[PDB]
Amino acid sequence: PSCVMDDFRDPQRWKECAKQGKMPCYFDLIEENVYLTERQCECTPLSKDERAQGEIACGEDCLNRLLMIECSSRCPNGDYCSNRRFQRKQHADVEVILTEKKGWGLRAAKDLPSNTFVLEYCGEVLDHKEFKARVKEYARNKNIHYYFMALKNDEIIDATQKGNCSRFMNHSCEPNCETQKWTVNGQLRVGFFTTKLVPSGSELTFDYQFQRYGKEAQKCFCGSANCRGYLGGENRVSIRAAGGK
């Protein structure tokens, strides 16, 4: 049982597939972060000719790229800037699938070169007060899966109620993906990038480095030879610490 990203674009069909167990449970799909309470490069423009030859605009040597800042619309390379991935939503070809013990997860729908942008991890951005409120609510509902992602000390991204398919990436003690923090329009975002060549059909995983505040830690089914056995590891941390202090 698996689906493509566009199956998530039609809430009605999504909803009925969910009742048949054909899609994960419903959540609100959003194209970019939403704050619960609100708060140029030096590349030489690529010639028309060099672009037909297939050269790259804002490639490895772009100054914004190297600092993990995306270019604006005012970029010297204009429409041709390749350093706009988050804003252009140019994600990897990825599928959502039902795993054996982890719930739903993400699968590569074709070969993914090393260091390929996968998806942005989007959600409602929480401050400490909202974080703690949601901690309680989720504990109280008895949620199994957890979606909190530390962004910066006062900012947690909560993908529980709202987000995109990124909320499905499972943890692995030997992951093929990693988080990167990218600056887009003065604002900080997180996205997943492959850490190596990922053959078509393989599950996409990252290392959560999970900071667990719960009494009991969830067991890890990653199946890695080095598996640490639990999500969050050995230590339990305080809620304030998990939350960034």
């Binding site: 988080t179 667990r212 009494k215 830690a217 939350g243």
Partner: peptide, 15 residues
């Protein structure tokens, strides 16, 4: 109090 829960912590992959 919470039986289960926690936060995913972004970090760069190092081998």
């Amino acid at each position: 109090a919470p039986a289960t829960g926690g936060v995913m912590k972004p970090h760069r992959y190092r081998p």
